[PDB]
Amino acid sequence: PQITLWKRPLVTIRIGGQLKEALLDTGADDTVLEEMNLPGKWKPKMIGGIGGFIKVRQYDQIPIEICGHKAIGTVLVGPTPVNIIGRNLLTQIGCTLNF
Amino acid sequence: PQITLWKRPLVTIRIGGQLKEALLDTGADDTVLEEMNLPGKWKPKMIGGIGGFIKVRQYDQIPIEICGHKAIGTVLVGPTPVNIIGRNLLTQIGCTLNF
Numbered sequence A, B: 001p002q003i004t005l006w007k008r009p010l011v012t013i014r015i016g017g018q019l020k021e022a023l024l025d026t027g028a029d030d031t032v033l034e035e036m037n038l039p040g041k042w043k044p045k046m047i048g049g050i051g052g053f054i055k056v057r058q059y060d061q062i063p064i065e066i067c068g069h070k071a072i073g074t075v076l077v078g079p080t081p082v083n084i085i086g087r088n089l090l091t092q093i094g095c096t097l098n099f
């Protein structure tokens, strides 16, 4: 599909038995999801945005379904105000910017 | 152009005769530039990201040429970690997400 930018580019994502709304975010290197207790190994990390850094948990090789397209990769979990789909996954679903 | 997301979507912008690199950012509602001088009236504003809130100066009706395409709109100036072109100007240059 083509998504215009008049409104926030929010789309449905699925990660396990959790369906969530997430921002397709070309300004995000990484994918950052709201707090969720995912299984398996993780590593602590700090990521920085406009107003400073937050502490997140880095989970690797997590399958995530974005608008019905399959992806699998690193997901950062922590106290973000919005679920953010970053470039690590946007490239996997074939996402480009066009103008 | 078509811009892939294997690398940060950084483009050159022209604002007030100066060239800057800025990030095409679909997850940003607003355009936020690193501290710089701009002419005219401005108003104190606050915006929130990951990490919290910052204080910015809001300049209205500022021309920016973004990768060859003209926009004229609101530009926020403050302690953003990177110059970001948000949806308010992305829409003006006809930018969409496609996959």
Ligand SMILES: CC(C)CN(C[C@@H](O)[C@H](Cc1ccccc1)NC(=O)O[C@H]1CO[C@H]2OCC[C@H]21)S(=O)(=O)c1ccc2nc(NC3CCN(C4CCCC4)CC3)sc2c1
Pocket: A025, A026, A027, A028, A029, A030, A031, A032, A047, A048, A049, A050, A081, A082, A084, A086, B023, B025, B026, B027, B028, B029, B030, B031, B032, B047, B048, B049, B050, B081, B082, B084, B086
């Ligand atoms: C600001 C921008 C440069 C980055 N932000 C994405 C942005 O779209 C954000 C998304 C957003 C939206 C809403 C709320 C909150 C956020 N929007 C935003 O702040 O918009 C504001 C402007 O307009 C307003 O409208 C929306 C909010 C306002 S971010 O959310 O903070 C963000 C996301 C993923 C990410 N991955 C990282 N990995 C890497 C880690 C490793 N390091 C390197 C590794 C070794 C050294 C450094 C590189 C970064 S660092 C990093 C930072």
